[model samples]
Target: GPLGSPNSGTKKYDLSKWKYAELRDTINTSCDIELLAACREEFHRRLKVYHAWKSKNKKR
Candidate 1:
């Protein structure tokens, strides 16, 4: 049985119909190891930039 709410009758679809996929194919086009490593390094570099920015603006 569906749970009854004030807005339940106004909606047509059930909210529980969503499906989640595990282990999706994130990298399907290329397998260049150097490119992958560069991407990871760039991500860490961006994190460091954010950390520096936050440290400078944090309220003491």
Candidate 2:
């Protein structure tokens, strides 16, 4: 229930704030079919782009 939680105080929002993968997992695990089909693609796409972005930024 939090960093919504950042490094200063993280819990579940480690990536939740910056991405949608966690939400996707929650949806699927909860079998939210109404949020599947379309949301799945969006979730994966976002994760892909974020990964690509991080990969390109080695200065981190």
Candidate 3:
């Protein structure tokens, strides 16, 4: 058996549903390089839209 069992109830579809900064913080703690790249790709994609919306609302 493996050293420890894993938790459950999460799917890949729920992966991108995180605040970018918070996601980056969590990513920093991860060791898997490929997963990090995938997460960052989604993070930047989400971040661009998030910033545009925020800036739209905060225009001065």
User: In model 2, what are the clashing residue pairs, if there are any?
Assistant: 2-5, 3-6
**Tens digits of lDDT, candidate 2, 1-60:** 753634564442233342456575767576644556546666677778989987865664
lDDT of each: 0.47, 0.59, 0.70
- Model 2 residue runs over 4 Å out of place are 1-34, 56-60
lDDT of 3 at 47: 74
Summing lDDT over every window of 10 consecutive residues in candidate 1, give the lowest-scoring window: 17-26
Evaluated at residue 16, the lDDT of candidate 2 is: 33
Candidate 1 — which pairs collide?
none
The segments of candidate 3 whose C-alpha lies over 4 angstroms from its true place after superposition are 1-14, 19-22, 54-60
Off by over 4 Å in 1: 1-29, 56-60
Model 1 per-residue lDDT tens digits across residues 26-45? 22443557545544455566
Candidate order (lDDT): 3, 2, 1
TM-score of each: 0.41, 0.37, 0.43
Model 2: residue 32 alpha-carbon error in angstroms: 7.4
Residue 54 of model 3, lDDT score? 71
